[PDB]
């Protein structure tokens, strides 16, 4: 795909009272699981593809802010190049004290509508200006039926989700964990691209890697010529490079400012 384009992954977690304190046992917690997954993938993406875009946005909350001032949606950190200033923001929520902070700052988890949630994430992708190579949405929920109560909400959900599927945006959920209710044919077989109570697809997002990559690119295009007359077009590409540590930048001791060497 277009090289200057960049990968963009948005994070979206069920903020209802459903999984905020599910904790059937005392060994895990879905929010402490989803936030752990987000922190791990986001710190890995720091080193891996620092040029890309990430964003975290919770839905069903009680406090509100977003681009369109809707109900029960919180854009925690917008789409931007990854950075530590957000590693800390995510880390602020990791913990039982952290979940206390989260609940008393945004909410226990009010009513919601994934139609409007997808609305919000779509607006987020629309907002930023850099061209996007791939566009992926990660849900974090286990309420496998978002609402069996208001069918109109669910009809609006298929409609908007199909639209997003046709605006160039993919969507994905990993079924985190639920006592029963661990199926995807219930309202999601038509959304995502048999089943169990936990997703293998989220385990690898903890593999915690520090590789880095560069996309399909020539080192140099040179015209191979069989003789003085026959010439063919060859792209000299590289398949092993011996990565070195990123070159350090000189900082003035105390301002931490760049120092702009002037030899």
């Amino acid at each position: 795909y277009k090289y200057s384009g960049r990968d963009s992954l948005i994070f979206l977690v069920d903020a209802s009272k459903a999984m905020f304190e599910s904790q059937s046992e005392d060994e895990l917690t879905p929010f402490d699981m989803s936030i752990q997954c987000i922190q791990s993938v986001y710190i890995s993406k720091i080193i891996s593809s620092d040029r890309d875009l990430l964003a975290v946005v919770f839905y069903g909350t009680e406090k509100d802010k977003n681009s369109v001032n809707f109900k029960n949606i919180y854009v925690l950190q917008e789409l931007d190049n990854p950075g530590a200033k957000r590693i800390l923001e995510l880390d602020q929520f990791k913990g039982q004290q952290g979940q206390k902070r989260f609940q008393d700052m945004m909410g226990h988890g009010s009513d919601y509508s994934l139609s409007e949630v997808l609305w919000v994430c779509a607006n987020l992708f629309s907002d930023v200006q850099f061209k996007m190579s791939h566009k992926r949405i990660m849900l974090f929920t286990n309420e496998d039926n978002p609402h069996g109560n208001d069918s109109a909400k669910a009809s609006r959900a298929r409609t908007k989700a199909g639209d997003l599927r046709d605006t160039g945006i993919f969507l994905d959920l990993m079924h985190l964990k639920k006592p029963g209710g661990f199926d995807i044919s219930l309202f999601y077989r038509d959304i995502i691209s048999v089943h169990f109570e936990e997703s293998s697809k989220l385990e690898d997002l903890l593999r915690k890697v520090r590789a880095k990559e560069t996309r399909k690119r020539a080192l140099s295009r040179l015209k191979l010529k069989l003789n003085k007359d026959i010439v063919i077009s060859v792209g000299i590409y590289n398949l092993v490079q011996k990565a070195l540590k990123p070159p350090p930048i000189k900082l003035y001791r105390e301002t931490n400012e760049p120092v702009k060497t002037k030899t």
């Binding site: 629309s126 609006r156 639209d163 046709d166 605006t167």
Partner: protein
């Protein structure tokens, strides 16, 4: 402090409009609007019960959006309407709904009705809700207009996001209608004025201010005494009806009259109070920015401020606006190469009537008293300001001679007016008559050309091809038929809908989709491309009558037709009997592009 529109949800207005539209009868539409306005005014009295600025304006500017003047133009019609709904609703850019919205005139029984099409697209999509009231609706429209004027398409999209989200399908239908400024209620605006007040229409004809109408005429029982034209207030100019040349003397009460040339420019009225000047177009739009609010600014006001007499403090003038050529000392007719409202030519205002002198209203005085007042209120400056010179006559032969003189001078026509007629704003005729060469049968050099393109219609003519692209042929060798055609102009008027339906049924099996990257060889195209094309051998000759041949950068012939319409569908002629570029050039050069060069006898 508060307003009723803040308490009247927009859904109620939508329900009233839907009932009016679904009503078959004028009585039923009238009675619907009865209940709406009566409930409104009852709520108004209850809410206020004691100075007031709130009026029916927040709702009436929506019921009659074509009359809106406070709000600036939205910049959005059907096309960015479809585009914005696609983008904001994030529809698949190649999906069925998006393609139907962008091609609402192409049938896929509501073709050409962007309302129905968007409503059916949105009905499953956004069962949106929560009762926006009239004044939030007004505020969001104000925001859209202010962002369009402020060059903020993102803020336009923002405001439209709130509008789309927090309104239902029927509400958004009606919103789209109000943005387009076309409701298709089936009820006449003069009906709504007689509804609102017995003097509503008359006050509108002199004010062009919906807020003023609502504010002064809120009480249906309290009627104004002397409604007249006021300074700096845009009044609707009075018009001229098509005259009967054989009955012209009878139409003028068998008494003496004036005959004068029809100027080919733009209608404009002037309001002066010393150094402050205001200008209003025929539709009431202000162009004082171009023309000059002070004798130090504008293309006209510095050149005219000294033309008035010393005692002229307040003056309202009605006249025609044209461009003056200083080198040739003649007028350049409106159209190509210039726009008089946005300009080595110089600005020139010719005035044919007055409505206001310092303390004397001149609407109800005879046009002769008015003209005598014109002849004394200011000294003409040639090429800057002139008096439109009315020439006296008493016979139909004088009318015919003046029409022939206008034809010889390549003029548009002649104005013939009643000396004893008062100024009647927004009245067609009632003393003023207009005569043109195209109004007389046989004086016209008409065009038999061939249909080569087709376009889908809209509105009442939706679902069928309401207009076509026309071309002229290349001269073929003797015995041979033409093979290459050059497009000349588009025509879509002159045929009854039954004739249009007959022609569409006849030609339906021959239309081919037009590809800009693969155009047909028999039909070359200029900048203007048709939606569908038809091979010449399967097409039909149409007889076209148009005012003149004017230069054009949209058609390969280098020219197009001004005011074209179909006179006859020439079924008696074959497709190869279409005229040639030689005939077109001969007609263009016969009378300097004017197609009327024959006297009336």
């Amino acid at each position: 402090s508060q307003t009723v529109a803040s308490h009247v949800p927009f859904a109620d207005l939508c329900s009233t409009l839907e009932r009016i539209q679904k009503s078959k009868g004028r009585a039923e539409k009238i009675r619907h609007f009865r209940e709406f306005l009566d409930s409104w005014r009852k709520f108004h009295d209850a809410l206020h019960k004691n100075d007031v600025t709130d009026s029916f304006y927040p709702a009436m500017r929506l019921i009659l959006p074509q009359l809106e003047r406070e709000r600036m133009a939205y910049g959005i019609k059907e096309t960015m309407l479809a585009k914005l709904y696609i983008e904001l609703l994030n529809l698949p850019r190649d999906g069925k709904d998006a393609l139907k919205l962008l091609n609402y005139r192409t049938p896929t029984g509501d073709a050409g009705d962007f309302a129905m099409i968007a409503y059916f697209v949105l009905k499953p999509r956004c069962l949106q809700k929560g009762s926006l009231t009239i004044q939030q609706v007004n505020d969001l429209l104000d925001s859209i207009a202010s962002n369009n004027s402020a060059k903020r398409k993102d803020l336009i999209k923002k405001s439209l996001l709130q509008l789309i989200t927090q309104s239902s399908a029927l509400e958004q239908k009606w919103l789209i209608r109000m943005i387009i400024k076309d409701l298709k209620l089936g009820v006449s605006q003069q009906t709504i004025f007689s509804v609102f007040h017995n003097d509503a229409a008359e006050l509108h004809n002199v004010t062009t201010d919906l807020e003023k109408v609502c504010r002064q005429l809120h009480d249906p029982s309290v009627g104004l005494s002397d409604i007249s034209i006021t300074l700096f207030s845009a009044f609707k100019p009075m018009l001229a009806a098509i005259a009967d040349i054989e009955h012209i003397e009878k139409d003028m009460k068998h008494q003496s009259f004036y005959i004068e040339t029809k100027l080919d420019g733009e209608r404009m009225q002037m309001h002066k109070d010393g150094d402050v000047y205001k200008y209003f177009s025929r539709n009431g739009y202000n162009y004082t920015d171009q023309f000059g609010a002070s004798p130090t600014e504008g293309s006209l006001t510095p050149f005219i401020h000294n033309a008035f007499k010393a005692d002229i403090q307040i003056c309202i003038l009605d006249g025609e606006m044209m461009a003056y050529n200083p080198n040739t000392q003649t007028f350049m007719q409106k159209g190509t190469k210039f726009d008089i409202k946005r300009m080595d030519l110089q600005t020139c205002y010719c005035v044919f009537d007055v409505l206001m002198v310092n303390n004397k209203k001149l609407g109800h005085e005879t046009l002769r008293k008015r003209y005598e007042i014109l002849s004394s209120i200011f000294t003409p400056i040639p090429g800057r300001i002139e008096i439109v010179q009315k020439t006296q006559a008493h016979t139909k032969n004088e009318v015919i001679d003046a029409l022939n003189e206008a034809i010889d001078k390549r003029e548009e026509g002649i104005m013939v007016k009643q000396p004893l007629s008062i100024y009647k704003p927004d009245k067609r005729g009632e003393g003023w008559l207009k005569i043109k060469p195209e109004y007389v049968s046989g004086l016209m050099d008409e065009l038999d050309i061939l249909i080569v393109g087709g376009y889908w219609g809209k509105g009442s003519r939706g679902g069928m091809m309401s207009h076509f692209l026309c071309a002229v042929a290349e001269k073929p060798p003797p015995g041979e038929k033409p093979s290459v055609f050059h497009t000349l102009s588009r025509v879509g008027s002159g045929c009854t809908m039954k004739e249009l339906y007959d022609l569409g049924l006849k030609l339906a099996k021959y239309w081919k989709p037009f590809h800009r990257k693969a155009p047909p060889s028999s039909i070359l195209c200029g900048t203007e491309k048709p939606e569908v094309y038809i091979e010449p051998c399967n097409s039909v000759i149409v007889q076209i009558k148009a005012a003149e041949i004017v230069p054009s950068d949209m058609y390969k012939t280098g020219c197009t037709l001004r005011f074209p319409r179909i006179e006859k569908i020439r079924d008696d002629k074959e497709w190869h009997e279409c005229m040639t570029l030689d005939d077109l050039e001969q007609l263009r050069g016969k009378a300097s592009g004017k197609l009327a060069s024959k006297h009336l006898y």
